[PDB]
Design a protein around this ligand. Structure first.
Ligand code: NI
Length: 283
């Protein structure tokens, strides 16, 4: 196979701190970011220009997602808070209390109206818009699914857990896992580590292959339907891979905290520690 390499096309500034999270709204008209400057910002995707900015977290913003079935935006931050924003009204409308520590990330179930959070308190929690216990350290990322097992978490205990109980726990990683990605066809997924990015088959989590080579602190993993997998790390390096073969076909304060494709999958957006969002397309 063959993927054209990606190039830098835009740099969007405006935050005043590390950009930790990024998400694209389902209509592909705007995207939303969160930063250590404690603000949530919404930008038009075509112009890159700032549309709106929301405040309400008192700590770093670590997770964002725009609902696929609502007019709502959800967010979780290091202040242990998890909020429901109505940007049509541009304000918080609900709180989700229950985590005992900083909340690192979230994902939405495709059609059950549930929100899933992952926190430093080593648990994931489900929220109607349960408590998933068993991990022995911070859960850095969580992915939600349609079929069983619907919940996938990556923890600082180096383990993957397929879930209000765990079905599968996979211990193959030698370092703590910090990023997990689902493949849009939902038969395979991948887990990020400093030692290796590992590929697993749903639903029981069967190890497929090791994707070696990205020797850094992997903060983010994202893939599009064409099979282009993206890994961003705290040193600012980014490794592009072919999903099926596992080939690393391109290698491009500094650091990458979140990456996100747009709905067209022709744009790749990065949340970086230099306080900017960088947009890449294919050359
Ligand atoms: Ni409250």
């Amino acid at each position: 196979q063959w993927h054209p390499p990606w190039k830098l096309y835009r740099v969007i500034s405006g935050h005043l701190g590390w950009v930790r999270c990024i998400a694209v709204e389902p209509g592909n008209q705007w995207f939303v970011t969160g930063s250590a400057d404690r603000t949530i910002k919404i930008w038009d995707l075509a112009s890159g220009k700032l549309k709106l900015s929301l405040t309400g977290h008192i700590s770093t913003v670590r997770g964002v997602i725009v609902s696929t079935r609502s007019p709502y935006l959800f967010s979780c931050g290091e202040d242990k808070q998890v909020k429901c924003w109505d940007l049509e009204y541009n304000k918080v409308i609900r709180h989700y209390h229950g985590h005992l520590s900083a909340v690192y990330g979230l994902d939405l179930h495709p059609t059950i109206d549930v929100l899933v959070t992952c926190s430093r308190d080593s648990t994931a929690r489900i929220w109607d818009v349960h408590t998933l216990s068993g991990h022995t350290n911070a859960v850095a990322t969580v992915r939600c699914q349609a079929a069983e097992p619907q919940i996938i978490t990556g923890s600082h205990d180096t383990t993957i857990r397929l879930w209000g109980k765990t079905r599968v726990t996979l211990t193959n990683h030698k370092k703590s896992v910090r990023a997990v990605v689902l493949h849009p066809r939902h038969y395979t997924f991948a887990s990020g580590s400093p030692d290796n990015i590992k590929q697993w088959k749903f639903p029981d989590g069967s190890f497929i292959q090791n994707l070696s080579g990205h020797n850094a602190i992997i903060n983010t993993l994202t893939v599009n339907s064409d099979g282009v997998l993206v890994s961003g790390a705290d040193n600012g390096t980014m490794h592009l891979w072919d999903w099926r073969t596992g080939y690393n076909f391109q290698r491009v304060e500094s650091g990458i905290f979140a990456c996100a494709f747009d709905q067209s999958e022709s744009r790749l957006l990065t949340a970086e520690a230099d306080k900017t969002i960088k947009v890449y397309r294919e050359d």
